[PDB]
């Protein structure tokens with residue numbers, strides 16, 4: 149988890165800005181626009197009027213007694229300790245007139261589910277950079293805070309015009325989840341069977357997210373030989389889909405379109421047995437080592453694709 153000079157400096161400049169804000173209050177915010185929704189909430193792009201800082205404000209509507217909300221706010225304080233170039237910045241949390249507010253760093257490229265809608269499909273070299281950021285974010289959360297994400301999916305991966313890729317919406321408050329109490333289509337087979345689940349279930353979710361972004365479609369059930377012929381040249385109810393994840397072979401990338409290293413990488417993420425599934429091993433996988441040495445202009449690709457500007 150060692151940082152380069154540029155990463156260390158950006159992290160230092162975020163904390164210095166954060167120290168100037170102080171106590172977050174409802175009336176100190178002006179709504180600019182809506183960014184997205186949401187695991188039981190809506191996210192707005194806001195102006196924090198006293199400090200002049202543009203933030204992303206997540207609003208969760210919850211009607212509960214003062215007892216429960218005071219514990220939720222104290223449980224969200226753990227987010228002030230998460231400082232990584234792969235984890236979205238956190239400003240603070242508060243409660244006001246029936247709703248919890250989570251204030252965080254604004255990512256101007258939005259989430260990868262929105263980038264995927266625009267782009268159609270994301271190239272392999274760009275997915276290499278996304279894979280590194282997700283592995284490094286998951287490593288940080290586990291090593292420094294003994295927590296796992298539990299909800300890896302394209303909508304929980306944020307991107308910006310500086311070429312940064314960061315994870316958001318990892319559950320840290322037990323009381324907040326209980327009071328509420330999202331899709332289960334990215335959950336590993338062992339999680340859907342209520343069995344033994346570790347950080348291995350997040351690796352499955354990553355592999356699944358990568359296949360979806362590479363092909364430009366949620367990958368279950370697999371596309372037919374004619375669907376792939378349309379795409380590259382070369383309905384299912386949620387309960388049926390969850391049964392398919394548990395009982396059928398895992399999805400895979402089509403061949404002769406992606407490199408064998410990218411194919412091998414997603415196959416190792418998507419092995420149904422959590423013990424056979426790769427863990428440290430992903431960081432030294434051929435696809436990851438090749439992608440780390442590649443000089444990919446992610447910010448450039450992103451700005452051109454979504455029209456950022």
Ligand SMILES: O=c1[nH]ccc2cc(O[C@H]3CCNC3)c(Cl)cc12
Pocket residue numbers: 183184185186187191204236252253254255256258259303304306316317
């Ligand atoms: O700029 C952001 N910073 C922090 C958080 C955040 C969350 C966002 O969308 C939620 C709603 C859908 N999935 C994640 C979106 Cl679209 C943007 C941000």
